[PDB]
Amino acid sequence: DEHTITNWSGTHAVRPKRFFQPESVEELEKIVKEAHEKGQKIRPVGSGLSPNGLAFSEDGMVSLALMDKVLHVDKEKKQVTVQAGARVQQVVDALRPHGLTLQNFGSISEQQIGGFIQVGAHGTGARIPPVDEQVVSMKLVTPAKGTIELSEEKDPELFRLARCGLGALGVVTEVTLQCVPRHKLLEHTFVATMKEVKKNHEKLLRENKHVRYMWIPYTDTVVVVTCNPLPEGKKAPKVKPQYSEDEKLQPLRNLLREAAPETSPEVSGLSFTELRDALLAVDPLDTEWVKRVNQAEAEFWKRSEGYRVGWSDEILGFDCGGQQWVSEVAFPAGTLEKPSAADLEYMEELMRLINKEGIPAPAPIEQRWTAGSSSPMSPAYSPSPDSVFSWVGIIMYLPTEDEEQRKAITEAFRQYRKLCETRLWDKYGAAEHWAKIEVPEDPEELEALRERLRKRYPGVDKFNKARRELDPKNILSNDMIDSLFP
Ligand SMILES: Cc1cc2nc3c(=O)[nH]c(=O)nc-3n(C[C@H](O)[C@H](O)[C@H](O)COP(=O)(O)OP(=O)(O)OC[C@H]3O[C@@H](n4cnc5c(N)ncnc54)[C@H](O)[C@@H]3O)c2cc1C
């Protein structure tokens, strides 16, 4: 096959020897039977977007992109049954006329339902669990046992394991999700100091349906975004200083005119995100320069306070348009009833570590919250139904297609992430997002990662027993899965 599959950020790519794209469940069953019989690789792939290339296998991959129909809406239960190849956007568009939406959304909507659930993807909202916990039922095509129906009523132990199964336990053909009524949100964006955030944090998380913090390294600016249901006819309030787009961008444009080349015709057409990339591109690993870029960004956010009203699917998405390295961890932050400071303590220690080690850390460091999941492979697995997890995402941008700048940033990010891993993750019980975890080549570092996984997931041995039972010739797993779970 001549199909090349590249991830979002162009950090991983694969050209599979065999690429299957069945149009029917019947065709997929035949593919899985035949691959099992011959011991041929068929790793499942959705949109192929994962930052770590989790789906990729040079031997063989199977895509259900052509199996993308909404099969049934249950009005009374507010549930949707969809083929696993549908993109989130496609399900959202199909649910609009039914007055339904998904209980939550990440920053993008071009993921397939299969790829979304299999990694335990999440949005924000301390009372709202990750998407795997929103799965009511599913159908799973397995090498060793054929097609199996799973739910709380049908083999709940395997259901909970396979709905967040990393593509290793079977090919998911159909998913039933728990929806909520279609609704408008009021989004409030405001800037705070570390000290102001600490004062109001406990209440803010419990009194706002959605909260996200955007921490700006080397500044005392935190951008707070809250979203709440908008009563029937309420209008967006208006902030008393009104800044034009040009006034918001002024600090970034002024800074860019002070680099080795306030606006030209070429600088003028740059969005905020394009301007941030143009600034970092000057000297992306020079910490003194990144301090100045981050301070100019804080000034942009200070000029961007205000309110927006929109349908939840429009409002909860946000811009990750630029290629980047990301790492995100989930760690426990008590419960709705028993608050914990760990979420803010983590961020204080991270900011201190960045400053001490001289990390050229750009903005933002994204902080979200979810409820716990009952899926044993969820990074937010908890037996507590009112558990709260904090999710912290660090980033470095790849502002150009220049191969040598990209390598240097790649190495810089490996070191930034390793410092968080060695200094913070064990202390806070932090677990890496499955779509962002990288396999170290250093077999020492690999064994330390395997030990962290066994500590974070007491479910690991049961996952590997299900892999042996359902996929004994290992046709669904790639080198990454084999490296993480030997
Ligand atoms: C710009 C960007 C923003 C993002 N924002 C967020 C965010 O806000 N929140 C968040 O939690 N994540 C986020 N992610 C991560 C994203 O949700 C995951 O990478 C997700 O898995 C992507 O879906 P996909 O369809 O591309 O899956 P792929 O990357 O193709 O596959 C992911 C996994 O699903 C498995 N798989 C796919 N289809 C099937 C199937 N039918 N049956 C069985 N296994 C299957 C694959 O084997 C693999 O293990 C973001 C990613 C990007 C690139």
Author numbering: 8 to 268, 282 to 506
Excerpt from the publication:
In photosynthetic organisms, L-ascorbic acid is produced in the Smirnoff-Wheeler pathway by the multi-step conversion of D-mannose-6-phosphate to L-galactono-1,4-lactone, the substrate for the final biosynthetic enzyme, L-galactono-1,4-lactone dehydrogenase (GalDH) [EC 1.3.2.3]9,15. GULO, ALO, and GalDH are generally named aldonolactone oxidoreductases and form a group of sequence-related flavoenzymes belonging to the vanillyl-alcohol oxidase family. They oxidize the C2 carbon atom of their monosaccharide substrates and thereby generate the characteristic, redox-reactive C2-C3 double bond of L-ascorbic acid and its analogs. GalDH is a dehydrogenase that reacts poorly with oxygen.
Multiple sequence alignments and structural analysis outlined a noticeable discrepancy at position 113 (vGalDH numbering). GalDH displays a strictly conserved alanine, whereas fungal ALO and metazoan GULO possess a glycine at this position. The A113G vGalDH and sGalDH mutants were therefore prepared and characterized. Steady-state kinetics analysis revealed an evident increase (from 15 to 200-fold) of their kcat values for all three analyzed sugar substrates using oxygen as co-substrate. The removal of the Ala113 methyl side chain creates an access route for the oxygen to diffuse to the flavin N5-C4a locus. This feature is manifested by the presence of an ordered water molecule on the re side of the flavin, at 3.8 Å from the C4a (note that the substrate site is on the flavin si side). In the wild-type structure, a water molecule in this position would be prohibited owing to the overlap with the Ala113, consistent with the blockade imposed by its side chain. In addition to the N5-interacting residue at position 113, more residues in the flavin environment likely contribute to the oxygen reactivity in GULO and its repression in GalDH. Nevertheless, even a simple, single-site mutation can drastically perturb this enzymatic property.Fig. 3 vGalDH variants.
